[PDB]
Symmetry: D2
């Protein structure tokens, strides 16, 4: 399995130290193997980080904060600007590494790095706008103001699916806001974590700044638990399951810390009878099949109107038959493999429980005979009452259910514990005003004639209910990475009444 030469340009070797602390690479933890989901073959080896490595790096990361906080915000924005340009120079290579290690199709991965690049460009302008307020006081010779200050150290625990995009949105904002970043990437994604850190480390070194500003570790739940329990980390940004999310939240809340939660999503698309069937079918395909259904924003529930029901799914199966399943690096591939053999096993056992709950498999449902973790994109006719519908299967399974009124459609959409993304395909404005109103969708993302997956830097990305409540990317999200202080200065010689 060569190259090799491709990994060397990303700064990777056969065996790699998986701990970036304190400006240098180390690792006294176990030696893990990085596998490609396309053939289940070794890309390289990673010497994981131990708690010993974590503590050594954490002592320096905390110490580096003093220096970093003192740097003016526009000057911090200039470091982030150079991070974006560093990523631009390796865009093509990082995209390939994301596809090779994670399993997502080449366009996605280039686009993932492109999302981080677009975020750096925004963070430069944002550095000039981390504004405070001068509030009028009700007392004479009193200056009242709202003051923002860095938190210190921001902990970032990321998932396998966006092995650098989640860090990108968090680190760009955290760094620009004067915070140091302690990153713990996915255990199955160590090479992307190293290559991403080497780009950041490059910029920090080029500007004579301590490498401890961007500390990173490769490992399992051990280092993750250490971050959640660390009193030196005021903010922990978690990205993963609702199961692990609550666990992290509980530990962080106990120590009076704050945490940004970006949890599981059971996203639904509602198709009204008056919808653009061509637009709706195309949208449903790319929302459900995209990243082999391993996206937080992946459409898992299809709420179909009775009038269009049959005609919609027969022309959806017709499109599902045309999905090219292959190597994510090969041109024309639409669906790649599932990240691990474990997820392939989970998908197959899920199909069995779906059948148990009365689910009728319209298309797919079977595994594909290959060296990699390949499965068929599945469409399931099921009742909304079935427990598997309220679950969250991280594979290409789409549950389709019939509805009569818009009131019953919203009832189904809001019934699930998760509240990340939702969509309606309709032409009538009365429905659009209902959908976006108080009695509409209870999600963080509410879309009209656009799928659940289409999300950009401009607006604050995040979910409600079981998806946490945390917000990323644009808007006023920066305020989560800083501390608000209400200040009042008395500059008058006037003494209080005796």
């Amino acid at each position: 399995k060569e190259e090799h030469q491709f990994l060397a340009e990303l700064g990777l070797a056969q065996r790699n130290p998986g701990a970036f602390a304190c400006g240098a690479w180390g690792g006294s933890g176990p030696t893990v193997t990085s596998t490609s989901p396309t053939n289940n073959q070794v890309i390289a080896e990673v010497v994981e980080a131990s708690v010993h490595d974590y503590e050594e790096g954490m002592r320096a990361c905390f110490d580096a904060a003093k220096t970093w906080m003192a740097i003016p915000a526009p000057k911090r924005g200039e470091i982030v600007r150079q991070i974006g340009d560093a990523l631009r120079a390796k865009l093509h290579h990082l995209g390939r590494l994301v596809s090779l290690e994670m399993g997502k199709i080449l366009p996605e991965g280039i686009g993932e790095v492109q999302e981080i690049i677009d975020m750096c460009d925004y963070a430069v302008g944002l550095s000039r706008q981390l504004n405070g307020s001068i509030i009028p006081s009700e007392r004479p010779n009193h200056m009242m103001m709202e003051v923002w200050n860095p938190l210190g150290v921001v902990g970032v625990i990321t998932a396998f699916n966006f092995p650098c995009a989640v860090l990108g949105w968090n680190a760009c904002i955290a760094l620009v806001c004067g915070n140091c970043v302690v990153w713990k990437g996915a255990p199955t994604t160590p090479l992307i974590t190293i290559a991403m850190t080497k780009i950041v480390a490059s910029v920090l070194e080029k500007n004579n700044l301590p490498g401890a500003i961007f500390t990173s570790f490769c490992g399992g739940t051990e280092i993750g638990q250490a971050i959640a329990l660390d009193i030196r980390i005021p903010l922990v940004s978690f990205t993963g399951s609702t199961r692990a999310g609550l666990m992290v939240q509980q530990q962080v809340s106990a120590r009076f810390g704050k945490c940004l939660l970006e949890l599981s999503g059971n996203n639904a698309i509602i198709v009204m009878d008056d919808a653009d069937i061509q637009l709706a079918v195309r949208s449903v395909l790319f929302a459900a099949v995209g990243t082999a259904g391993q996206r937080c924003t992946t459409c898992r529930r299809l709420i179909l109107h009775e009038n269009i029901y049959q005609t919609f799914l027969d022309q959806l199966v017709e499109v599902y038959k045309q999905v090219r399943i292959g190597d994510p690096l090969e041109k024309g591939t639409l669906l790649g493999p599932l990240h691990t053999p474990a997820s392939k096993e989970n998908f197959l056992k899920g199909i069995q429980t779906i059948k148990s709950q009365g689910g009728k498999i319209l298309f797919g449902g079977s595994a594909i005979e290959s060296e990699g973790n390949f499965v068929q994109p599945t469409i399931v006719e099921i009742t909304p009452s079935a427990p598997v519908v309220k679950e969250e299967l991280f594979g290409p399974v789409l549950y389709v259910m019939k509805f009569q009124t818009l009131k019953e459609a919203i009832e189904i959409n809001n019934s699930v514990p998760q509240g990340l993304s939702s969509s309606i395909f309709t032409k009538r404005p009365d429905i659009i005003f209902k959908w976006l109103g108080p009695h509409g969708s209870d999600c963080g993302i509410v879309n009209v004639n656009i799928p659940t997956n289409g999300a950009e830097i401009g607006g604050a990305f995040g979910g409600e209910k079981a998806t946490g409540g945390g917000r990323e990317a644009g808007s006023d999200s920066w305020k989560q990475y800083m501390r608000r202080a209400t200040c009042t200065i008395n500059y008058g010689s006037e003494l209080p009444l005796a």
Copy 2:
């Protein structure tokens, strides 16, 4: 113990139903006695709310939300405007009831109701500004927007010290934001809870609105626990101890709900050698003695500079000797009684543990022989290392400690788990920039030449660390009472690439 006639104008009788649900007064719970802290005599009786009453009122409160959410925000602001005017008509009476039942001196109480009145006036203007955003999209024929919507039902659990001000700041914002309010007042403050509810109920009835919009209950931890566990309440605003705060937070976080925490404060005043000693002494007195030290913002720690140390405290004791201790309703009273006989017992046992930890009582420390819960205002010379300093005694005890450098002063101020309010008395601007900077105070409120207690409607009131993180009154605090939705409307016929 008459009048009586004063209570009748506030709508109170000898025995009162303590449950306002569903637009009517009830109560199937136990009969509690409301005592005056000045003589420990019965004012009136309150028939508490049971879980049965809570459930009946909660079913209607949840149902009323549909109607309330549909009312335009400026029209909701008009209801709040009339609430302020209703309070203005009973300002004099409510102030007396706050003094009589809670124990705070007449000026405070009138001022407390005045704070609610000023909040209504702000909430009217705010109703016209619950603005969303139209974000530029990166895709042609796409409308991107940030949409705000009511949460539904806001739960408000209040403490004894501000028996209506805490509700006032919460309810004004919650109601204007389209939410219904379920209030559970202090168990020792039921009469203020009833009288406050009768004013709100008056306005709601006058406008043909369901009374269930403002549901209120009198009771113990039972009704409070019910609110924290209620899945129908997306936001729980808690005001009380850090002990109970964490308990409420834990229960609310488990059910994927949000909670606004306004917890305990161990507030400190730092006096620099170059300070206006006249201003600093006056400020320290009113910050420490005010409301018999039963304020969340009460100065409990005095961090004194060695150069001014002796000269400051001898002239502080000289002022402490001049504190008039009497009936809070009597003119000229500066210090009233502690809210309950239990708090008087806690104060006295605290003095004993303070002596154990090497605390040298400079002034007071003893109880006053009276029918009411009167104690002497205390000044204690103590080392910052003592455990009682990190505690929170809800009485008039001031711990004084010597410092040499501004660096050791900030070290002491930030050492405590609580982070609500802090102050510095200085004339040099280099210290002011350090104090308000990243290496300064870690509190939510950071004041210069003004005590820890002086807080107005204009700025977002709240604390950091063990004080939670929740914000009240002005600024962008309204966003906590609503849900953010990132919306994208595709209005173009353009189909995604095949």
Copy 3:
């Protein structure tokens, strides 16, 4: 005439001093007669202000500013709160005076005073929100901030149509922003000017504030020219014709002053074939007939679709036949008289020039034989090419032109020099996105399925092109009444390189 008595309740007599200069009433100018447009009979007499009176009042108004600017903004907001309550106590009487003196129907006038009261409620909250900004500096130990400060004296020149609403929007903002107000009301509306000033003067006196904070004068263009040329007045808010607007602007621009312009509006309503004809007809009637077409937002142009053309206007004439023309104080009156006999003469000569340009009068066009200034509501079939269309006639004349496509409709709407208000009546979502887009309406107010006249205090009211550019009421309009200063404080010992 008697009543009389009703005038005494508003603080008016048979002969009134028309100059509120230096906290007291005076007037060395000519004696003018206030006439009722319903019968052309004398209500009372007003002793106008001379330039001598103006100068004496202007010296004190400028001097009072020192005191007023020193008052904290929330405390200034409390004065404007009290002004609203003072107006509430005389709501019924002011509405009657406005109707009697100006000629507008009783609902309007009562509604107009209510518009001012609503602005007072918003201004209280706004006083707490005149915020500055703390911008991050790119240099270490540098504090960068945006600072707002009062301008000093705000000059308000008002028109006859809104003899107190225009002042209300301006004065509420100006006063809260720390500015003194010098008011010059319309020469045909002095009694409203006096009665409005007496309410303000009442509040200012009750709070021991100099009356010079609110200076007001009754007179012609003489006092208006004096304001425009006065170097002591940094901001002149003008409300009137485009002819006088440019004159005021040119005198103010010459002396490096700023002016708020709220000029003429030749507002159009576009009716699409798919519109709710019942809604559109009702809307067109009240937009065109309302205030006898003497509103700045009055619909003067009806852009009708060919498919609905005939059917729309025959059912519009059917409705125009039902318009009750009578005493504005009499119940059921829909159309009252024109403000002066001069405006009645202008309307009649206009009808003649309309006939000259090929205008075919569908309904009305004639004067009504009575003692008052009554005219018939007119509908005119005309080509958009006609010059009279591009002009502004301040009477009930509606021009109606046929169109085929949306491009043609927008072409007509944008063709006029004025750009105040515009409306479309359609059900199509595409038309709305085009109408609100870059290629849509070029007006300050762009409405969908609502007439040109419906405007509230929540959003910034103002017009583009020949309507000036000035904004009133809500949003960020306050910034016009203050001066922005970009401040940078260097608090570091660092010296520049030698």
Copy 4:
């Protein structure tokens, strides 16, 4: 002269077409000579633009707007991102060209281009933030919103001193805001105008966009007058004298257009007795001598405290004696030549009128015998009453006047017609609160312990009084380049009362 070659690297030749109209280079106007102020020798020739060229380019620029306004704002921001990178590649060369053609020292010019590059980095983030608002309506089933739209074509008339920085601030904002830019550079700076346009044209061509988006012309007042009178240009951004500013304003106001005015500045530095004399002397030198006093922010007035008066100016003359006067391209040069021989003649005749008004020349005042336009840096002891003080001389002349109290100092600072920048050198916190307060400086820029010239892209740069009122760079300046529309959509079936 040769180099030559260096010019070819910037896209310049011996003779250059000076009209970038309709995506290609032309010019039917006269042939002008570009001279170097260091020796008065020809760099190259420029074939100016005629009115014929202007009209041809203006027809296409107006036509290109349709395409440009349709491009999404984040996508427009990407073009401005690329413009910054294009400038980065030629940073070294442009700085040299600016120095060679304008006469400013090499650090400035390299610094000036860097100011543009910095603005490009901010404009990318700003493209994602040109937000509208969703205002709560007071009527049910009504959507109220604030909508921003491009103006169309922005006219930019620039001065000689910042031959590309002024365009940079304007064009970055204008382009991101969806407007086309028509640029008219200073007649004495055509080569900088061409080289700057070639960089923009490069990016526009690389992205298959019409070159007409960025139209530029070389010429005198002829093309400038054409822009001011052009009805196709809604916004004219003028940068020059107060004399030409008023002329442009009056022509633009007449046609109901808007204009951004960045006029003359007679900036003052106030030195208090308690100031850091080392900091104040260094600051005064670089503020007054910088760019040979040919900056809009150049310190022209020194307001000195009587206690420090003599000691300050003797140590200022001592520093003025050390000013290196030479070739701006030569290392170590602190003062270069004046832009033209005409400005050298104006400086010398000014010295004569200064002597007439009782001005006593402390240092300099004489011309330097060389081929270039070199003059001595001048210090003048003068009374504030002298008329020359209130004027603006565009050379290195510093007027110095004695003061006793802060009232007297502010009186002098505010006495001049111009209100751009102002500074105080003090250590007292009281003076700073007075200086930044309502009774302080009446300028747009108010600095403490930092000179009048130090201005960055974070805050809105602009002046008050005779400096216009227009704002550039950061803050909410973008709103000037777009049109605000207050929109209300009625989506309810409710009909108005018959």
